[PDB]
Amino acid sequence: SALGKLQDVVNQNAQALNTLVKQLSSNFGAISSVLNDILSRLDPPEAEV
Amino acid sequence: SALGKLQDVVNQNAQALNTLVKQLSSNFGAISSVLNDILSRLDPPEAEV
Amino acid sequence: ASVYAWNRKRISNCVADYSVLYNSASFSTFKCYGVSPTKLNDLCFTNVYADSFVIRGDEVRQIAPGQTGKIADYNYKLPDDFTGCVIAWNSNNLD
Amino acid sequence: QVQLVESGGGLVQAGGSLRLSCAASGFPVKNFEMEWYRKAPGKEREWVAAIQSGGVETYYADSVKGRFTISRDNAKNTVYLQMNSLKPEDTAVYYCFVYVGRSYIGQGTQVTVS
């Protein structure tokens, strides 16, 4: 724990980057996380929401 | 008013938490800001939006 | 079979051409939900779960995600996350 | 909130005429399709007549085409049914039918032809 002032910066940078990448498994409220399975059999004035 | 440099910090934090409280009563485009009359008076797939 | 005992006939281990089913003009409505009918011939699926029933002619708009009705709320309910096509045609000449 | 009540029934002979009613409450009748069914004793419940929600087209059952008349009154919130050329095969309890969310059945009125 001597080098903690260097280590916590790299830890919070890597964990912020991992939290950014772990956002990529979310449809945010859609039916599925696949873009085409949201959009393309639904009518195009009603999948844009 | 000699102690303004401590009082403004407490006032800013209290106004931040009160502004966080006072935006719970915002519709953001809704009929009502409470979940229960949204769930009661509206059909649940079009209450989802 | 009618809507109290709606038939579930699953389809597996074959190649499903949907361009034949698209270009047939005998069907009245072709309401669809998942992923495009142009590329229905282009993708591959795990299961089909094909269904078969007869409704009233005014009960066509009950077959949607999250409707209300004695068919919808009491007899035959679709999920809100339903991915499929509704294929319907008139059967006054057969029933 | 929604309730159908039926009146206008009575005892008629073979070839008599009568006119029923189906007074409705809780919903307007310019938006829903309207039907009538009948229950003969010893027979199943069978559909009689229908007018759609727009009020444009009329339909009837196979044995009652050309003889029965269905009419609607949107002002009084009442649907009527007219009898002409009555036969004793139509001895039944007549229920009026509507689908307002879920279908509601009234208690009906006994109409006998003898």
Angle formed at CA C30 by CA C24 and CA C34, multiple of 5 degrees: 120
Residue C95 is encoded by which pair of tokens? 């029933």
Domain boundaries in chain D?
3-113
CATH architecture of D3-113: Sandwich (2.60)
- Most D CBs within 10 A among C3, C55, C58, C92, hence the mutation to make, goes to C58
CA–CA min distance C90, chain A (Å): 23
Question: Would you list which residues of chain C are within 8 Å, Cβ to Cβ, of chain B?
Answer: 65-66, 68, 80
Experimental method: cryo-EM
CA distance linking residue D85 with residue D13, whole number of Å: 10
CA distance linking residue D48 with residue C45, whole number of Å: 46
How many CA atoms lie less than 13 Å away from B18 in the CB half-sphere? Answer: 6
Dihedral over alpha carbons A7, A8, A14, A16 (to 10 degrees): -170
| Annotated resolution, angstroms | 3.3
Q: Are D6 and D98 in contact (CB under 8 A)?
A: no
Dihedral over alpha carbons D24, D30, D31, D32 (to 10 degrees): 50
- Phi, psi at D11, each rounded to 5°: -100, 120
Residue D61 is encoded by which pair of tokens? 């059952």
Question: Would you list which residues of chain C are within 8 Å, Cβ to Cβ, of chain A?
Answer: 32-37, 39, 81, 83, 85
| Residues of chain D contacting C73 with CB distance shorter than 8 Å | 102
Q: Kindly tell me the sign of the dihedral angle through the C-alpha atoms of A21, A22, A27, A32.
A: positive
Q: Given CB atoms, is D102 within the 8 Å cutoff of chain C? A: yes
Distances (CA, A) of B35 to B17, B18, C57, D23: 22, 21, 36, 38
Instruction: Count, in order, helices (H) and strands (E) of chain B.
Output: 3, 0
Nearest alpha carbon to residue C63 among C37, C38, C33, C39: C33
CA–CA min distance D14, chain C (Å): 32
Nearest alpha carbon to residue A42 among D75, B39, C86, D83: C86
CA distance linking residue C80 with residue C72, whole number of Å: 12
Q: Are D51 and D34 in contact (CB under 8 A)?
A: yes
